Amino acid sequence: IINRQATINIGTIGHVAHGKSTVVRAISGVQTVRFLERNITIKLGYANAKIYKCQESFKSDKEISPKCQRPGCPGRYKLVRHVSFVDCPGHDILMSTMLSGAAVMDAALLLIAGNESCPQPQTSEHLAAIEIMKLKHVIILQNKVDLMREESALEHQKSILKFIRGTIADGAPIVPISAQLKYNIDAVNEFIVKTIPVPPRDFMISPRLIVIRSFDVNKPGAEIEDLKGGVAGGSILNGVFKLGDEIEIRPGIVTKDKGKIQCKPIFSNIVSLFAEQNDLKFAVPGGLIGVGTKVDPTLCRADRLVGQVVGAKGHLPNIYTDIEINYFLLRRLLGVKKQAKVRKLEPNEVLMVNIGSTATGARVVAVKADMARLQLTSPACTEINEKIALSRRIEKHWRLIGWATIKK
């Protein structure tokens, strides 16, 4: 079987202390990245899951290891798909990293524990963000069943089925699994192949890249004579990248501080590409690929490349300070444990506006019926339209209000 990188981005959502990283470990094998220098930029893990089906039974055909000795048939497995995991945070404060991960994703995996309460505030907030940013391919997973009884787990299923009625998603598959015990993983791998079709993705579309994480490979003990370039942990949704192409990071750079700054987007050339495990020349869109650029390892250290757009040379994305948004408000607030009715937007108020991956604090200038004018403190770029989820300060930390679209 030939070595191939990620084809589709599949994420995992749940709640705190459930064990989302243990679920990722049970499916793939390699443990989470977060658990100082390398990887650390946004709260997300990295593990690649292998799907090889033995068609020489039913659900047990899709296996973790490529060599088939487990299901019964001595014949070797056939290549179907290779997937990448982008684990999103399940916390009320960490909202910008969740919405940044949702734009990267194409399919979702929901985790609800048996022993805990049925209506959870964070999972409903993740479900609302899925409905906003178009991620309808959702598989519901039960986290812990062995602590629960025979009838109580069935009653918990009935409460989940009654909860999913008014939402847009109608047909979502439900699987009972365990992370520590390691069971029924083969059924989930079967559902990933069947229920999720890969969207049409072509060579024709102009190259665009979204940077989430920042890698710097500087080793203790090793001298300055051998240095590695600043690798950007970015995700591609459109346009095929290869080795030896010019890249500009759009929003801007702070290098010089009376007067004015007149700086271009950060120019860099691709040196190395990191995909799956081994070195590869081509970058297939629909997966997290570590693009090793000429940009300094000091710039790709910690918290500098969190939600920044990248365009290829010969293309001009526009930089905006005043953005025109077409907003729609929900009935009641999602995320809070008391649920309150969403009030009308007041002029001049700080709101965390997440345009795909960019985290910006924006002030409302004019209030209308459907449209709103917003002024950004830090510049954010717009390419086409981009899916936006709005969040506001009402009670202590940030709470989601609704969805928005740029009309430019």
Binding site: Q157, P173, Y183, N184
Partner: peptide, 17 residues
């Protein structure tokens, strides 16, 4: 969909430590 789920749950309860 909650029809093949009940067979998967019964398979899980049968094979436990």
């Amino acid at each position: 969909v909650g029809l093949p789920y009940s067979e998967l749950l019964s398979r899980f309860f049968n094979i436990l430590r």
